[model samples]
Target: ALLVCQYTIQSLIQLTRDDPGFFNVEILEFPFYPACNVCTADVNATINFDVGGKKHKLNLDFGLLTPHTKAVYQPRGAFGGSENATNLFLLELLGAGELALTMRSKKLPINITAGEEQQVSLESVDVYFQDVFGTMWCHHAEMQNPVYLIPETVPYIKWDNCNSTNITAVVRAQGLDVTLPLSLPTSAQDSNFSVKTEMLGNEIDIECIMEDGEISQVLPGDNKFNITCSGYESHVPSGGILTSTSPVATPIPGTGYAYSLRLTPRPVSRFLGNNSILYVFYSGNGPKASGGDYCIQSNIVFSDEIPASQDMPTNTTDITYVGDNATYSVPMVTSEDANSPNVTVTAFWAWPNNTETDFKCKWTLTSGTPSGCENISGAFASNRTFDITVSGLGTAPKTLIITRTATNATTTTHKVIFSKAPESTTTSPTLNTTGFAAPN
Candidate 1:
């Protein structure tokens, strides 16, 4: 007589790539139990089947040991009964048949054609064997044991501390819970995980920890922490701010994929310079053919600079020799595109101690343009060897100074000293000198 039962089953299958680049299929099995409690006492049963033209019979067990409890059963081949058992009995059975085997718990009969692949579904059986006050017979009865499936492996977190600071201990979770070392003291440890932490001690140290998720610590003066995700690094500043401001995931009309970066200056006096240069290197896939490919863009914006007076010389013969500016904007041009032809703007400047005599006065842009192009502007002491000229009148005598200015998306100024030309002395002498001769 066939028994009628009510149950639901879930199943999964896995395949691996072979040495010859082919996929090898494998079978896995799990046990099922009734949703409702039936009775006490462990249940055992036996089933016979055919494999590879060979007859095989296996013993299976089911039923609960305690009253009002459910029963569980273990497959034919399981590990020596370890909590961390990796050996799966059903998998072994399929291996023996030279055909990946899996278990299915369904009311419908499982059918496998000669050449067609077969899939078997299995349901997880929850056997509450951990309950206290249970009879020793219930614990000793291995017939009511259920099988479990282990989770797949996950990629480890990899990171590096590219700055000098001390990172505090912290944890993070991605899609799953994970625990990461507080600090990665050596390169060997960094190789295992995707992230590393260090204590540099200048600014607040940045620490990246993996705990089924990603967590980062912000340095004292730092505004953000950069996290590399999917091979692309993203900047996350303090206040839980996101660097990318684009509303859409893809690039907007007339704008490429939006990105941002942040910088924090060292507190030490020597760390400061008249002209500070911050460099950010970004590498990634360009826009798609339908969406663009991979490309690199750079922006040189100043967060702060040393006071101009501190860097520039007090008594410099050349007006341009002194560096009295707080910040400098470098101009760069964007890549040539049919739709976007404008150049990018990049900024650069010399420190106070550095001589500005050899500095270039030209400018360019990085991306996007305003109504007009960018402009350059500044002051000068004289006009002896300058490109652009500026003239200003002094109390003792009139003087001319050369200043350069460019008009573009942004305005920039540069000061240079040309040659100083003395006032013209060829004018006539005083009129009273010849009075005596004129009267006669």
Candidate 2:
């Protein structure tokens, strides 16, 4: 005979709320007789049985099998509870390691191992995160991940000296905003940037500011700026006078005379840069005096009219003759008188005779010397001749007397005649004589 004893045990199973929370439970049936049951029951029954015909055994020595209950598994840290059971759910909610989670002022650690959920501290990550769990997560905020800083794009601003004179530079920032300040050396405190400037041999300062950087200063006039700045003195000319010769007197005849006046400018330190023009004013006489006693006449006889373009060499000369004659005669005679003792008369004559006949001439004595006086005689049928004769006469006044009283005198008269001896002509004359016989 066999006795079967059955007892129903109800156990409550408490389990950690994790994902896949279901647990498997199994039961086994066995037959026992009264004697066997009494002996087995008396021996505490340390039994291992295959439950539900599964090969794995359940040990009953510890306790009876408990009933399993399912509960929601919640993940710690910034990831939500088991209601969201996907493997990516925690990572999607917390944004990888960037999420920071704080509970009771303590940060939780989260990690994932072989598809298992892990909690790691958000403080360990160099990142910034936001909490989607509302005000409950207000205590902590995550910083964004660290990265290398990239430089920003900016416009270029060029620097220049404010007071430079020679070089005129225009700064072009186009549409971009730029700031320029007066940057001067310590010695140049009075200089500044301005539209127009007056520099009394002083240097200037200049500075530049950009949108992305601080303003930089440059002492442009100093040696450090390395700028090729230049200034030149603007040339201005103060004028002075350049005159030609003084006013010339007008000749008696109204013959026109040409006169010229030259203008030479004084030297100047500065050049006029092609801007010099000249105006000439003539106040003195023209060739003919029109109204005033002094007429102003000007003639431009330069190599070139442009004063600056040409160098002129000017000079003048005058030729005059004073005489009135159809034909004229001049006698060059010795200074001694004809009657002087031992004196000889020398006479040079240029004739202006306008007659048809050649003048025949001779010389005869007037007084003194040997008697029956015929000193010398000759006839020259031609227009010109020199009749020279010598007599024993001294140079004292009236010591020798002779006369060249010519005969055959026609419209052509004696050109020149000189006689040396007794000073009178009382000699006898021949036929067709123009004069007389003997002493009266």
Candidate 3:
């Protein structure tokens, strides 16, 4: 088959180089045709081609044109004199028209084998003709292997209060979504080509390290990658809350001044809602960290609410008993109470001082008509006390029930027993045997 302008130009399409230092100058048309002989007859040769109307040069050496007919070349020097140098020349010719290659080979030609792969020699000069190099050649590797599409946003690691088993590494890359279990010393990956990550917090170095930073270069494979963060962890510094006292109130000598500090144990709800604030004081420079200027700061989270006591009772004990014909009083109001009216419906132990006030105290007659028990049911005042009296007592015990109500509508009752004073009369001795009962 004789080569023509249309056939020759349409045969050549693209040129590319691999990392292993081989070239692919693709020829899409006739392979091992007579023109293949001219292309292969070169050890060192030159081809001049034009794009649009500008002229450019492609110098070749140790060129191999196979019957499969893809042209291959090896560079004579290091990277600069080789593939890298040739790529720049082709890069400038981009956006131009078809390349019309004029090839000239000058050298010794030996036995050429069209069966097995063989090398041809072009030690000296010889010119060969093929008109209109129609297709343009360029470095097409960039389009073949595109850039990795990992996101710019740093991955987030949910601490879950340092639960290693519940932690997972989350990654959002390009159209990929992956969640890898981060259960310490344990490895997780969705598929064979998926990300393989482990040791969640410290390894990926997102939020779990104490010293310096983390590193991520252990595994090996092509396009077999991983993501940020290892396992979530929680840490409590060894140094806890402390207190001190100063000598002399105003910097005087020999006078001692004392001070103390106690933290209000915050409930779990406070931690989750972030409704509580705590201040920490350190002596010198603080810990090392990044992403901010301060020593270090982080959001606190809890897996479950902490336990707390909710008991509502005045400092006084359960019941108050007054002697017959006697009057007594008890305190019904306190200075310290919950800020808002029953915000946390549950009350704490100790005096009702830690809870709401708005209290009502009263006494109800349970058994036997008793006097001075009237006018005892009413509201309470801080200065006024719960006053009660027992009069006209009877032989049997007279029971008085005291009921108390607070702003939270919680009700409590205490019993006050009233009885007559004991009679003081000595029993007559049996004078004359068991028969004589009473003195007459």
Candidate 4:
């Protein structure tokens, strides 16, 4: 009985169908397994058995088996032309390895003695795999690469001191939560003015917030700003003023990068209320800027102190014209005593003066300049309105010369042809000359 059982075991377990001494069996001349699906989550299998060298197909489902398994099939009765029990299936699987993460110890973001504070996460991933139908679920792994916030070791910076070009990060952080390095370095472009550095980290990205991601300005926090193209590649600005940039298509497609930033910000960024004023102090032109120029740059702003609406100044006229005084009074003063005036005015003036200081007469123009005379302000902290009496002056319209001369000052020659006064409101005609010299 034992010997018969041995033949029964050898019949199915061995590739050969013939036992050494007990049974005549037919073994398959070639290998039993096909090229695919030996050890996988999907293992719908097949087996062929027979002693006549011809094959009897036996289909089996092994999809539910563990990574490793051993199985037996046999009964006390005659089962599948054999009345003995002893048959086995063997399996073993190799496990794919796992990955681990660690912090770099030095310059880690966890240190607190000096920090500007930014948070980062490692939750997003993109991966590809062979057709396992299951690796899609198992392949999601998380990792962390710490980030540091570097403050301005010093306050003021030069154009070359620090920037996102010389200073940026790997940014695998919470996607847009790209924190800064321990501190900013001297930029390929200039950094800040003689100013504060609450936001020194520079890159051609946005100030994206964790709560608000929409493309609008949040009232409380997360202000979006212009990203100046500088110190980086692809779209470099031309001269030192670092103006603008356009998109560059890499033939490779999605090899994307957003490095350079800034449109030159306002010297200071701020908001105004219903009752606020904005005075922008800027020179319209300079050496550094020919098309334009700004210093407390990084360079734009918000303003209009006059009408409560923001006035945009495009040309020099916008700056010099528009106010209580419309045009600039550029004094063309030449200190030539010969070109100076000697006054002969028929006047009972307000200020106290004589022939020696008639140019110092106290008079305010009712409106504006007369011919070549600038309406220079008359009253000052030191002097008061004085009186000048015109002796033997008749009551008629006449032209007079006023020479405004002084020590250490320009000699001003202003000719005043006054409007005829009360009771003297008549043009003196020379023996009834035609049209009375056109009313003086």
Candidate 5:
């Protein structure tokens, strides 16, 4: 209704004076691109999924796919004033469509008189393909099965993958459905509407809506309207997963006909409890996401453990010397609990180099004596690294091996050479030697 939009009148200063042209409108569009631009990616991704069973590529511009951030990629498109110039040129040309088409589509039937049944004929015309915007199907129209929801010429609907997942365009001038090739005509107020959506697994509840996203409200009348989604539709059960993606029979986002449903391959069970486990797919934007990083995680989660074969631990444990007082941490003590997830326990004992009884040393979580054990008898001896400490080893610091053998295994002896910090040096009578040296 804005007066500025109306170009009904022509001629400003006539071109006769070689003056400024008439009806020569200058369209000044904002520096921009499709607010919601999306396309297919060359790689596999969770978001890059299928719709109606066909794998269509997707790419929503910053504003659409993410939060409302439109101009993020503006420089990529012609900006400043050039974009506007091109836009105004196109708009004035194709902008004013056969306004009559709108009239015939919405007003014709109501104009019928008396018993003369309104006879209608179809005229086919070739027109440039139109990008109907995100709110509507944006895919290439399929030739063989043209026309969907409203039973129009479009072959299929290209639903967007926003938080909501569906579209149904019903126009019953009246009715449209799981119909039409499954479905009715509705009224003006019912022009197009969306259903309240509910989901089951990766599938949709399939049926149900609220307000539909539509173009124009259908005018009131008993007018006949044909609907079609002429294709093999795999039905989805309400509250049940839809086996195959199906057509969102119309009245979508319009006429109180909006629908939404969760998409999941299968139902889930709780990993820690009844709360279901969640797996997230990411483009690696977070800190832990490759090069990203949070904290105050659960207490136990802080000590998070992993299996040895899983991968190297990001944390490093300082190596301890023979007598260094320190306790090492590992995912688990496997030998202590045979079925435990992790185990790094091994045999260890300090032994003399001179040798003695044909005694053997054993160590392990299950071993009778673990680290720092002692010789119970000449037949068996075991002790810890500290047993051979400075004061305990007397004045001799001879090299010795700490031998370890598994509790019940007769094979595989682990030996490591070690010695008390070389016995501290001592000079008993060096002073007396200095005074008596002349006597020799």
Candidate 6:
């Protein structure tokens, strides 16, 4: 009788045609709960048993599940259709792994130093799954999660020396009161400059004032601030004649050309009595530019002294003419004197017989002669004279150019005009023989 009782116990737990084990077990509907939910939620599950080759209902409760936690299910009584509970059956349930967030727009790794207040947005936020594993329970349409602002590092503005004349910077955001870099004085070094700011998103305008009075708005990025003598050695320009030439495509050696910048006026003048103008000559034909072209800018400086004159290529002497050759004689000057004038002459003659037909020429230097007076040549002498033939000359004009051997100076043009001669008659007495016939 004891053995039979033991067998009965085994038969009650074992799978048979009457109790064919739980079949078609499913969690039909899991009650809705927010992600990281705070309240307890209920689960709806469905399971089936077999009796007389027909389906039978089985009721079981797993109780309330924690929010954001996965729910696991395991077969208890001969789970499924293997005639006995040999195979393992398992199921898990949870809220959706993917979520939706409403936002106007979003950018990653945003700049915080723009000084503009940044607010949270919710237009159409879509969350994507990356490392997917178990099947996640998800809502059909009504699924949303509250958004929060994450903590980030504080921002800053780093000042750096870019070559010389400019004070450049690297901007980082997230701030308040900033006394823009532009408002500072330009003529001094950056050591005298000052600025202040905060660390929350704000709206502010910062700009850079250039030398040419152009406004450069400073945005959230790399910035360049202009300063008068920021990184330069101060060599105040010597107050003299501040002269400049026309912008020519070619460079001239007389003026300090070939240099990227020239400091002295042409013809290098003497200031007051002794001090001469200082000059620096560099090579390059480009305008004083920005960036690494600081060399060109360093050579040019702003001075407190305004030059006496900016006019240039000045005419030093009055023009001379041949008629005043007696009063305004160009002295017999050698190249060493550097005061002789360039000589050029223009002359016209009337009828050879009617007018004062004879004109004479002289030479302080010889061998090389003027164009129309090429017939005269000899050794150099101040008193020595040369004659140009004037026989049968006419109304036609003539020109002469004499290169001054003394000094290589400018050309001086001399003009000589002649009076017109009277016309002759066709029929006239041979002589005035009837000159004194007393009027009776």
After superposition, the stretches of candidate 1 with alpha carbons farther than 4 Å from their true spots are 8-12, 15-50, 53-57, 63-182, 185-440
What C-alpha lDDT do the candidate models reach, one value each? Answer: 0.22, 0.18, 0.24, 0.21, 0.20, 0.22
Report the candidate with higher TM-score, 3 versus 6: 3
Q: What is the full ranking by lDDT, best candidate first?
A: 3, 1, 6, 4, 5, 2
Q: Is candidate 1 or candidate 2 better by lDDT?
A: 1
Cα-based TM-score, every candidate: 0.17, 0.10, 0.20, 0.14, 0.14, 0.17
Q: For candidate 4, lDDT tens digit of each residue in 43-124?
A: 3222223222233333333333222232211211222221111122211111111111111111212222323332222121
- Superposition error at 243 for model 5 (Å): 20
By lDDT, the better pick of 3 and 6 is 3
Residue lDDT tens for model 2, 162-227: 222221111111001111122112212222211111111101111111112111221222211111
- C-alpha lDDT (0 to 100) for residue 37 of candidate 4: 23
Better of 2 and 4 by TM-score: 4
- Over 4 Å off in model 2, which ranges? 1-262, 267-271, 285-440
Model 3: lDDT equals 0.24
* TM-score leader: 3
Model 1: per-residue lDDT, tens digit, 311-346? 111211233211222222221211122232222222
lDDT tens digits, residue span 347-421, model 5: 223332211221233233333443333432112223222122212333333222222222221111223233434
- Per-residue lDDT tens digits of candidate 6, residues 19-138? 111111111122221111332333222223222234333322333433334333333433123222211232233112111111111221122213343432111111111111111222
Stretches off by above 4 angstroms in model 3 are 1-156, 159-267, 270-308, 317-326, 331-386, 390-440
After TM-score superposition, the amount by which residue 85's alpha carbon in candidate 6 deviates from its true location, in angstroms, is 99
How far does residue 358 in candidate 1 sit from its true spot (Å)? 99
RMSD, candidate 1, Å: 33.7
